């Protein structure tokens, strides 16, 4: 890919399981007799990760638009491999098993996913405000998970109840069918532009769609699809 | 013709006189209100307070 970047051609780079790259290094180091570090990993983990990742950079001659995957052993995000990857990224997207087990197949945790370009100068003022509000909601939800778990929904205040309802609606709404998921899911794929996503979430945060039951936000596109499904259900 | 009912607002027996010294009023002063209510309110409020404080303390799960 560096040859194409050096000549000016834009490159889309898709590496799969950078972890597997690190695990192999670990096995090679174990066979090489090096002194093991942390959970059996190689002593030269950071240097190997740097040597691989610093080559994945957009330079002044060309740009590499790199998308990587990382496998977390078990479900431990504190494992040395993902912990080393985290500092080598502009955008991080954290998929959680708990979200996935809720049939939310995108499975992305909004609170554990960040990006450097989520900047009002770069992405737009409305997009930035909508994203920050969609995080402040679901942060109020994460702060109240135990109270809902033990005492129940009733003990919360009225505005807290509203924020929790909107947060659960947002969790359902982040779900989205994929065109490549037709093999095991019957939902047709949906492509939601960034403008439509921002508008849908801004409308959801304003209050439009409060009357809609949460189940209608599951496996939908923009807010218009949810409204159409609600009207179909009457 | 066969029964009498008195739907009286308040019925008192001053003839007893010792009713005050009697638990009817004496206990009403201590065995009632003092512990029947005040102690109930104190204990229940303390339980709610301990619950609220520990539910703040558990706000990291």
For A12, the enclosing helix (H) or strand (E) is strand A11-15
Positive or negative, the Cα torsion across A110, A113, A114, A119?
Answer: negative
Q: Taking an 8 Å Cβ-Cβ cutoff, which residues of chain B contact chain A?
A: 55, 58-59, 61
Tell me which residue of A132, A20, A22, A14 sits closest to A65, measured CA to CA.
A14
Spatial distance between the Cα atoms of A49 and A21, rounded to a whole number of angstroms: 9
Q: Is B58–A146 a contact, with Cβ atoms under 8 angstroms apart? A: yes
Distances (CA, A) of A200 to A105, A138, A160, A178, B48: 19, 17, 22, 18, 41
Please give, rounded to a whole number of angstroms, the shortest distance from the CA of B40 to a CA of chain A. 22
Instruction: Please check whether residue A155 touches B, CB under 8 A.
Output: no
Nearest CA in chain A to B58: A146
Name which of A120, A112, A121, A223 is nearest A172 in CA terms: A223
The DSSP annotation for A75-121 comes to T-TTSHHHHHHGGG-SEE--B-HHHHHTT-TT-B-GGG-EETT--TT
Q: Which residue of chain A is at minimal alpha-carbon distance from B57? A: A146
Instruction: Name residue, tokens 């990857």.
Output: A85
C-alpha to C-alpha distances, A13 to A53, A69, B8, nearest whole angstrom: 12, 11, 92
Chain A: closest CA distance from residue B2 (Å): 54
Find chain B residues with C-beta within 8 A of A145's C-beta: 61
Q: Can you tell me whether residue A64 is helix, strand or coil?
A: strand
B52 to chain A: nearest residue by CA?
A: A147
Residues 6+ away with beta carbon under 8 Å from A135: A110, A111
Cross-chain Cβ contact A145/B55 below 8 Å: no
Q: In terms of DSSP H, where are the helices of A178-222? A: 194-206
Contact A187, A220 (CB under 8 A): no
For A39, A53, A54, A82, A115, the CA distances from A87, given in Å and listed in that order, are 20, 10, 11, 9, 12
Full DSSP string of A142-164: HHTHHHHHHT-GGGS-HHHHHHH
CB contacts under 8 A, A 125-144 vs B, are 143
Cα gap B52→B44, rounded to integer Å: 12
Return the percent helix, strand and coil in chain A, to nearest 5.
50, 10, 40
List the single best residue of B55, B56, B57 to mutate versus A (max A Cβ within 10 A): B55
The pairing of strands A64-68 and A91-92 is unpaired
Subunit contact A151:B55, Cβ cutoff 8 A: yes
Residues of B whose CB is below 8 A from A150 = 55
Which residues on neighbouring strands pair with residue A14, listed in sequence order? A67
| Chain-chain contact of B61 with A150 (C-beta, under 8 angstroms) | no
* B46 Cβ contact partners less than 8 Å away, ≥ 6 residues apart: none
Cα(A200)–Cα(A192) distance, rounded to whole angstroms? Answer: 10
Mutate which of A149, A150, A156 to test chain B, going by most B C-beta atoms within 10 A? A150
Using a CB cutoff of 8 Å and minimum separation of 24, what contacts does A5-9 make? A5/A58, A5/A59, A5/A61, A5/A62, A5/A63, A5/A64, A6/A59, A6/A61, A6/A62, A7/A61, A7/A62, A8/A61, A8/A62, A9/A62
Residue A152 at interface with chain B, using a CB cutoff of 8 Å: no
Reduced to 3 DSSP states, what percent helix, strand and coil does chain B have, rounded to the nearest 5?
Answer: 45, 0, 55
H/E segment holding residue A46 = helix A45-53
Between CA B6 and CA B2 the distance in angstroms is 14
> Tokens standing for B6?
């008195």
φ and ψ at residue B13, rounded to 5 degrees: -120, 80
A205's CB contacts (< 8 A; 6+ apart) are: A130, A133, A134, A137, A166
> What are the CA-CA distances from residue A233 to residues A188, A212, A217, B48 (Å)?
19, 10, 13, 43
Element (H, E) at A128: helix A125-143
The whole-angstrom separation of Cα A200 and Cα B19 is: 74
Cβ–Cβ under 8 Å, residues A181 and A105: yes
Distance CA A122, CA A184 (A): 37
**Do the Cβ atoms of A204 and A136 come closer than 8 Å?**
no
Residue A226 near residue A216, CB atoms below 8 Å: yes
């Amino acid at each position: 890919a560096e040859y194409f970047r050096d000549e000016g051609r834009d490159i889309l780079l898709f590496i799969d399981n950078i972890f597997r790259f690190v695990q192999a290094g670990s096995e090679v180091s174990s066979l090489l007799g090096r002194m093991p570090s942390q959970v059996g990993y190689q002593p030269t983990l950071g240097t190997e990760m740097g040597e691989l990742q610093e080559r994945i950079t957009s330079t002044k001659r060309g740009s590499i638009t790199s998308m990587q995957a990382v496998y977390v052993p078990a479900d431990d995000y504190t494992d040395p491999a993902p912990a080393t990857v985290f500092s080598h990224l502009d955008a991080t997207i954290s998929l959680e098993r708990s979200i996935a087990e809720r049939a939310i197949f995108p499975a992305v945790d909004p609170l554990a996913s960040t990006s450097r370009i989520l900047d009002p100068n770069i992405v737009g003022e409305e997009h930035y405000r909508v994203a920050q509000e969609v995080k402040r909601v679901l942060q109020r939800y994460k702060d109240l998970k135990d109270i809902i778990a033990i005492l129940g929904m009733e003990e919360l205040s009225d505005e807290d109840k509203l924020t929790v309802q909107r947060a659960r609606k947002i969790e359902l709404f982040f779900s989205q069918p994929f065109t490549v998921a037709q093999q095991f899911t019957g939902r047709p794929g949906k492509y939601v532009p960034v403008k439509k996503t921002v508008e849908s979430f801004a409308r959801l945060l304003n209050g439009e769609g409060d009357h809609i039951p949460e189940s209608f936000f599951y496996m939908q596109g923009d807010f218009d699809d949810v409204l159409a499904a609600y009207e179909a259900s009457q | 013709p066969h029964r009498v009912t008195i739907l009286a607002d308040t019925v008192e027996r001053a003839d007893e006189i010792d009713e005050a010294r009697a638990e009817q009023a004496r206990a009403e002063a201590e065995a009632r209100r003092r512990e029947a209510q005040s102690e109930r309110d104190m204990a229940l409020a303390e339980a709610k307070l301990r619950k609220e404080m520990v539910r703040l303390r558990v706000a990291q799960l």
